[PDB]
Amino acid sequence: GLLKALRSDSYVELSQYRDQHFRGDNEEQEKLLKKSCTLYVGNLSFYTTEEQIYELFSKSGDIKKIIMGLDKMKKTACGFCFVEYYSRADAENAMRYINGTRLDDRIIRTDWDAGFKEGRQYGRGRSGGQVRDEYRQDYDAGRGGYGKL
Amino acid sequence: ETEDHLESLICKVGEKSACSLESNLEGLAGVLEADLPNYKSKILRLLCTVARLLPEKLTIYTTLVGLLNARNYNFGGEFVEAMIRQLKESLKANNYNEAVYLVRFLSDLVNCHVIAAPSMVAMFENFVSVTQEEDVPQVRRDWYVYAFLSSLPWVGKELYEKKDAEMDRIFANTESYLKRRQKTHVPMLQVWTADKPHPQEEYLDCLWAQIQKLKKDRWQERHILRPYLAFDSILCEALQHNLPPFTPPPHTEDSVYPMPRVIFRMFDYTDDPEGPVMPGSHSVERFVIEENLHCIIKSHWKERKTCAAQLVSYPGKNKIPLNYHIVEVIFAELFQLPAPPHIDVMYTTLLIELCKLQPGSLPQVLAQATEMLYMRLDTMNTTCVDRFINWFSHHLSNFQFRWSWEDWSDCLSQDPESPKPKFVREVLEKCMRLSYHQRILDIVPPTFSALCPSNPTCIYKYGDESSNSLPGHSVALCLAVAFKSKATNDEIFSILKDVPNPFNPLKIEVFVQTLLHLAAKSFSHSFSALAKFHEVFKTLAESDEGKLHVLRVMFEVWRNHPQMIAVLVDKMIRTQIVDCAAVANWIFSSELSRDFTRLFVWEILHSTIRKMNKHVGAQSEQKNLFLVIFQRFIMILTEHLVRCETDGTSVLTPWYKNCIERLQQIFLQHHQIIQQYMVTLENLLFTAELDPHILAVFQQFCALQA
Numbered sequence: 001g002l003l004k005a006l007r008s009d010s011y012v013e014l015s016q017y018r019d020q021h022f023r024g025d026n027e028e029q030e031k032l033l034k035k036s037c038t039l040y041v042g043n044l045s046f047y048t049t050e051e052q053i054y055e056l057f058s059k060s061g062d063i064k065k066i067i068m069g070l071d072k073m074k075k076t077a078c079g080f081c082f083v084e085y086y087s088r089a090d091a092e093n094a095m096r097y098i099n100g101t102r103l104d105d106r107i108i109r110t111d112w113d114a115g116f117k118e119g120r121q122y123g124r125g126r127s128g129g130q131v132r133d134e135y136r137q138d139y140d141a142g143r144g145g146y147g148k149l
Numbered sequence: 150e151t152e153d154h155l156e157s158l159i160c161k162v163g164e165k166s167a168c169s170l171e172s173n174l175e176g177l178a179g180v181l182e183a184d185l186p187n188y189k190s191k192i193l194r195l196l197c198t199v200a201r202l203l204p205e206k207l208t209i210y211t212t213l214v215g216l217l218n219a220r221n222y223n224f225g226g227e228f229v230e231a232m233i234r235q236l237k238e239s240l241k242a243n244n245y246n247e248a249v250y251l252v253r254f255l256s257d258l259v260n261c262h263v264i265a266a267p268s269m270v271a272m273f274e275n276f277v278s279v280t281q282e283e284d285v286p287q288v289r290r291d292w293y294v295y296a297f298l299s300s301l302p303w304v305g306k307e308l309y310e311k312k313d314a315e316m317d318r319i320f321a322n323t324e325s326y327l328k329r330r331q332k333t334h335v336p337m338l339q340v341w342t343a344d345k346p347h348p349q350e351e352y353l354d355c356l357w358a359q360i361q362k363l364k365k366d367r368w369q370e371r372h373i374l375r376p377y378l379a380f381d382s383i384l385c386e387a388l389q390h391n392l393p394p395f396t397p398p399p400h401t402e403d404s405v406y407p408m409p410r411v412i413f414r415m416f417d418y419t420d421d422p423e424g425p426v427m428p429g430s431h432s433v434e435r436f437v438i439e440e441n442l443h444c445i446i447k448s449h450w451k452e453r454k455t456c457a458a459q460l461v462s463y464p465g466k467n468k469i470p471l472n473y474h475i476v477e478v479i480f481a482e483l484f485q486l487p488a489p490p491h492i493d494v495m496y497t498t499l500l501i502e503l504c505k506l507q508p509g510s511l512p513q514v515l516a517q518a519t520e521m522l523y524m525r526l527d528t529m530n531t532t533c534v535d536r537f538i539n540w541f542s543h544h545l546s547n548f549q550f551r552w553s554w555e556d557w558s559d560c561l562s563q564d565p566e567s568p569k570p571k572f573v574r575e576v577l578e579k580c581m582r583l584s585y586h587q588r589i590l591d592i593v594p595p596t597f598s599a600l601c602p603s604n605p606t607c608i609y610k611y612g613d614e615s616s617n618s619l620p621g622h623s624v625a626l627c628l629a630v631a632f633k634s635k636a637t638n639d640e641i642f643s644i645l646k647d648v649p650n651p652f653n654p655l656k657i658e659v660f661v662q663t664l665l666h667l668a669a670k671s672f673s674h675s676f677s678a679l680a681k682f683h684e685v686f687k688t689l690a691e692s693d694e695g696k697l698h699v700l701r702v703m704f705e706v707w708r709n710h711p712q713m714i715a716v717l718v719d720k721m722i723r724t725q726i727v728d729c730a731a732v733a734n735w736i737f738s739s740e741l742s743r744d745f746t747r748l749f750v751w752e753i754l755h756s757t758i759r760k761m762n763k764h765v766g767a768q769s770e771q772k773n774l775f776l777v778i779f780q781r782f783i784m785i786l787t788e789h790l791v792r793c794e795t796d797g798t799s800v801l802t803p804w805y806k807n808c809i810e811r812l813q814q815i816f817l818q819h820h821q822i823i824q825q826y827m828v829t830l831e832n833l834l835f836t837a838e839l840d841p842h843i844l845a846v847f848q849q850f851c852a853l854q855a
């Protein structure tokens with residue numbers, strides 16, 4: 001026999017985020033999120049390299065591919081990436097133990113992703129970067145100073 | 150009522166509550182009784198479930214079951230009967246670890262007046278009797294003895310009081326058995342070979358010494374919480390049941406027993422003078438504390454924040470230096486051989502959650518422990534050193550890489566190949582991978598400069614410096630133009646025809662030198678470069694020599710960037726540019742002999758073996774990969790030994806330590822799989838003809854299931 005209490009795996013649960021560009025029914029989006037091997041990683045430094053992301057995320061398993069987030073305009077690093085694993089299990093351990101730890105001295109946040117599609121590697125903010133950075137207020141050195149607009 | 154509510158009540162009892170534990174137990178006893186006429190079946194299953202899945206809460210549930218037996222004798226009887234069925238069912242399925250908890254549960258039930266002592270003493274006689282069976286694995290005898298001895302901290306006193314003659318008899322048999330046991334496996338499981346300051350003991354010899362002390366102390370131990378002692382009036386008047394004669398399930402071909410173990414030990418009371426006195430290495434208190442903590446982790450390893458909360462809220466009869474116990478148990482897990490109970494990175498973040506929870510105390514202990522681990526590196530096994538390296542560096546990257554390096558200045562004057570200075574280099578290199586070259590150069594004292602990793606700069610043979618006299622010099626510079634111009638595969642082949650043929654090595658060299666050089670910007674460039682010109686690769690390295698030459702050149706191009714070397718090999722294997730066999734032979738090649746003792750080399754080899762493991766159908770290729778690896782290990786190890794016999798020098802050199810332990814690591818990290826090849830290995834490679842130094846590793850490995 002088993003116990004429900006021991007099944008607790010809160011770090012692997014879906015978050016509130018939903019891709020507002022996803023071409024399909026929300027049901028189909030969650031359906032993909034639950035079998036996904038891809039993770040969205042946020043709050044990276046603009047100077048954070050792909051090599052650094054490989055070293056950190058490989059601790060939970062073998063990485064198939066990494067896609068860096070780029071400013072839709074200047075095509076430079078804008079602070080986020082997608083890490084795709086070969087197996088769900090390795091993607092879960094990253095959600096369990098890497099999410100919320102440091103990378104380039106910043107606390108990053110990981111989230112399940114429905115899957116990569118061309119055009120998704122670009123910030124959707126008006127100024128080209130990530131939406132979050134459009135109306136920011138603070139002075140984040142590792143994120144391009146002030147929040148643009 | 151919903152069975153869900155019933156489960157919640159049983160699962161939550163004993164947790165944080167305004168009322169006393171005793172009160173809550175009595176309360177639940179009532180509820181459970183009233184719901185017996187309609188949910189007795191469900192209740193039986195639930196109690197049996199927590200008995201085998203919540204060992205850390207053992208005495209909480211035996212007490213509950215005790216109170217119920219007192220109220221309903223027949224219910225108590227059906228619970229025990231259910232427990233025995235579960236025990237057999239568990240043994241039947243090779244779930245021996247789970248079975249032990251069931252055995253301790255039945256044992257403690259004696260203190261709850263639910264099971265007559267005589268019944269337990271008899272069952273244990275049949276347990277120890279297993280050591281007398283013929284033609285069975287030592288690991289089978291071990292488990293039954295362990296299940297017996299590890300139950301004593303709970304029911305030892307009572308059993309000795311009711312049947313001291315019987316018990317003296319069982320003990321005598323147990324001791325004679327422990328005296329003839331084979332100890333071949335020990336050298337392969339020790340984290341340290343040094344027996345100073347703390348000997349790393351074989352688990353059964355240690356548990357026996359602890360039991361001996363408990364006995365000498367008239368079976369009095371001051372740690373275990375026993376809720377039932379508060380219901381003496383109620384329990385001391387309940388009818389006790391008699392267990393049927395227990396016959397242990399015979400050994401079979403399908404039987405798989407737990408591997409033997411070695412007790413991790415790094416602390417004693419002198420490491421915390423101003424805190425509560427730490428129970429010694431040979432006291433049942435140390436055993437019970439670590440057992441409970443290990444179980445706490447087993448139950449909550451998935452939720453790091455919760456896991457840290459449970460460890461820190463661990464209850465005990467008397468106060469102990471909990472922080473030292475928690476830290477020691479975590480390292481005992483990380484450094485366990487063959488492997489840790491859970492994924493390595495988990496321990497890194499668990500330690501961070503513990504630091505956030507106890508900011509004023511946990512951090513000092515951790516730093517202390519880190520210092521001790523560093524100072525004892527000289528005899529630490531290679532597999533553990535790697536994990537130490539990977540943990541410490543990852544840990545530092547979460548605290549701005551701050552560390553008092555001058556504390557380890559002793560390594561500056563030692564032989565570069567020594568454990569300590571090597572550890573520092575490997576750690577700094579690891580730190581650079583999570584950061585960048587300058588960052589690491591600026592965090593260490595000037596005195597450590599030399600120990601820092603060289604700048605991961607690419608090396609192009611036909612760059613500016615180069616002369617035009619070099620073979621292929623023109624074709625190389627030609628390829629450079631073609632690549633910048635988006636040439637196709639056919640165009641690249643045509644350009645390569647202008648290369649003389651010494652399988653053409655020069656064609657490969659110029660092609661790989663140039664292609665890699667133009668994609669040196671990032672991993673993605675190199676990856677896409679390998680993919681785009683995948684055709685040229687397959688053709689140029691269709692032969693084994695070809696694959697071998699590709700790796701050789703790639704190594705000459707990125708020898709300063711180990712991380713790049715690794716990810717390139719991984720990609721070349723996954724896309725068939727080269728195969729695992731080639732990579733294995735490349736690892737033991739002359740061009741890599743100077744880096745043979747470095748970490749990245751073995752990280753690549755293991756990633757290669759794992760890829761082969763995940764490849765279904767290709768079982769022939771899997772066995773051949775192992776055959777190749779062991780074959781090369783035996784060649785170089787033999788070569789070293791023969792030369793030491795001649796030249797008359799000592800065998801135990803830093804190089805030897807690495808190589809011999811890396812061979813050991815192959816077995817440890819893949820003990821599960823290699824098992825099926827075990828036979829063939831003994832027939833063709835690890836024969837009696839081998840030098841004992843090498844054959845010994847193979848025999849220690851077999852000892853894990855002998």
Ligand SMILES: CN1CN([C@@H]2O[C@H](COP(=O)(O)OP(=O)(O)OP(=O)(O)OC[C@H]3O[C@@H](n4cnc5c(=O)[nH]c(N)nc54)[C@H](O)[C@@H]3O)[C@@H](O)[C@H]2O)c2nc(N)[nH]c(=O)c21
Pocket residue numbers: 017019020039040042080111112113114119120121122123124125129130131132
């Ligand atoms: C955070 N992300 C981002 N992504 C993926 O990254 C790519 C680049 O997209 P980005 O430029 O970050 O743009 P988004 O569409 O991802 O923008 P954002 O969610 O920041 O805002 C969208 C809208 O939602 C509003 N909003 C902000 N905060 C809240 C809130 O607390 N509640 C509600 N209800 N709404 C909120 C904003 O005002 C705005 O109108 C791109 O590919 C993108 O998909 C990503 N992917 C995953 N898997 N997970 C993530 O967390 C992210």
